[PDB]
């Protein structure tokens with residue numbers, strides 16, 4: 313019962329603070345961006361969509377906190393709705409970070425082949441593609457997610473009724489599409505950005521390099537701890553390890569803590585991609601004056 317009590321005494325407050333801070337940060341980013349009368353640049357649009365995704369993901373948190381505390385008490389319909397929202401927004405966030413990195417790489421590395429004389433380079437096509445792909449990936453949540461009434465704990469939670477092979481397949485898709493592909497795209501793009509910036513000439517390059525390194529390190533540190541534990545759980549399930557109660561409890565608590573840390577990244581997104589740029593701070597100041 314150690315894992316259950318730890319969840320009870322630790323998830324409510326953490327998710328409450330995440331909810332407050334995410335609603336106050338990503339909402340502020342969204343408002344600052346939507347306050348713009350003129351056009352919005354490519355990275356501005358991607359940041360807007362990222363802010364919306366993070367807002368929804370944090371919005372669904374308190375229901376999950378209640379789930380951890382006592383039990384699901386909203387029926388299966390809200391189980392399905394919340395799960396779909398969660399997965400859609402998580403995948404959207406990952407792919408939007410990858411798209412932001414690719415846009416930065418295109419603008420800085422291939423700087424002389426994409427030059428434009430101050431037009432709006434509309435990028436809504438990729439945003440629609442991202443959202444459609446996220447819906448396609450979340451379909452299984454729409455299909456399977458239900459609220460089983462456990463006869464072992466007498467509880468009632470939002471869990472999948474997949475077959476075991478299905479659970480492993482969904483875990484593998486999570487790992488591949490949410491972590492590995494975004495991480496590789498980010499790594500390539502930002503390594504090339506650094507390679508270009510080290511051989512550039514200016515005084516603004518230093519902050520750019522530091523920001524790039526911080527962004528990559530933040531993503532890696534925040535998300536690796538959870539995906540590594542997910543890989544350990546896959547290894548256990550496929551027979552690569554021996555099951556026991558103590559290991560089960562360790563895995564459960566580790567998953568809880570690592571997931572908390574991971575959603576802390578969607579909490580921190582405003583502090584890295586939005587508030588550090590002079591453009592966004594100027595827009596924020598203008599808005600607050602208004």
Ligand SMILES: NCCCC[C@H](NC(=O)[C@@H]1Cc2ccccc2CN1C(=O)CCC(=O)c1ccccc1)C(=O)NCC(c1ccccc1)c1ccccc1
Nearest residue numbers: 319323376379380394395396398399402470564567568571
């Ligand atoms: N043993 C019971 C809990 C097993 C799931 C595990 N729950 C947690 O750890 C914490 C703490 C915790 C404690 C005890 C009971 C419940 C929870 C809920 N948690 C949450 O925050 C929400 C998760 C959730 O109910 C959910 C999310 C999406 C769709 C449907 C449901 C977890 O793995 N959650 C994050 C994970 C994931 C969730 C569901 C299915 C597959 C994976 C994830 C999803 C997307 C991106 C990254 C990670």
